[PDB]
């Protein structure tokens, strides 16, 4: 029955080192609706992450946008980690500034 | 305005 989440991690605006921006984690195609989403900077949970209200698609699958303020640099690494029952383990997806 | 189903599943 259960549907596995798909994840995209990406910035709201094109990233410029030293410029404030928003980092997005867009999670889709999941069921059941319970899900746990964390965003990470250099391996460490980012404390202030906001979540959109949850919606679902004609598919029946749920989707949600997590987001947080960030100022990208040359060497800082960002990721989004999602824990959901459809998966044995939490899935981590890394930010690629070219994607 | 949404429909209100008056009979159960």
């Amino acid at each position: 029955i259960q549907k596995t989440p798909q994840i995209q991690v990406y910035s709201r605006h094109p990233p410029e080192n030293g410029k404030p921006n928003i980092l997005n984690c867009y999670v889709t195609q999941f069921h059941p609706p319970h899900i746990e989403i964390q965003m990470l900077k250099n391996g460490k949970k980012i404390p202030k992450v906001e979540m959109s209200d949850m919606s679902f698609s004609k598919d029946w699958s749920f989707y949600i946008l997590a987001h947080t303020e960030f100022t990208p640099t040359e060497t800082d690494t960002y990721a989004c980690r999602v824990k959901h029952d459809s998966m044995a383990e939490p899935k981590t997806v890394y930010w690629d500034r070219d994607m | 305005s949404s429909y209100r189903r008056p009979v159960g599943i």
Binding site: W60 | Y3, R4, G8, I9
Partner: protein
Amino acid sequence: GPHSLRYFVTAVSRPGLGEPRYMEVGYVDDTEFVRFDSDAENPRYEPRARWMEQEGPEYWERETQKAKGNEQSFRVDLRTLLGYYNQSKGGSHTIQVISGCEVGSDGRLLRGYQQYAYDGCDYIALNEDLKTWTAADMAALITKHKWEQAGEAERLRAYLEGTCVEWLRRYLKNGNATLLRTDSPKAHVTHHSRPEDKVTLRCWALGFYPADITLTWQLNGEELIQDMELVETRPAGDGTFQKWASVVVPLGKEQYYTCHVYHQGLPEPLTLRWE
């Protein structure tokens, strides 16, 4: 052109963590305009578009009452489905419903729907005829016969053809200007390395609304269907959307390729290449 009014409902049981959560979200065209969530206290039917604030206290009170009434119904429905599926009282389960009407430019119904799912899988759906039902399993057949016997399809046909359609008219009246909004994409091409003598051209479209968009790459005038990479269209977080599409091309041949961007907002399609 055409228009739609749809309500997306979710009921989620949470044994030992509280009462079932009932959520109801209304969309005009494909834009959320109202929402009810049973998990606020003094939960209230709420506007989600500023143009809905035109409606007034009586509307909102009647919709709140009706939503709390559904919440109670759905609690019972959840218990029933446990029986049908010989499922324990300890687990969380989900009922979902999509209910609504599509109308034409003349305001007349083009199609109505009332679809149910249980734990994310089709359960029962009203057929296009607005008279018969498709049950997806044996449990759903029990519901089908109860609903046939109770004249549920007649009820729905009346709502879909009249009430729903009339309310769509009314909401469009207050939202049509805001609904018609369009933000055109702004596009650009980035250039990235690949192994040996190949590179990646990535065509970005940013800042657009609504989400529907097409990006294509062409060699010389001829579409690279076989294998362009893309991302699913995604929210920027500010009401607009993003997409990109990329191709891998020979080092030195970048000027042989163009990207085309197709969107409602554009006077005409955009044609880009690598700087």
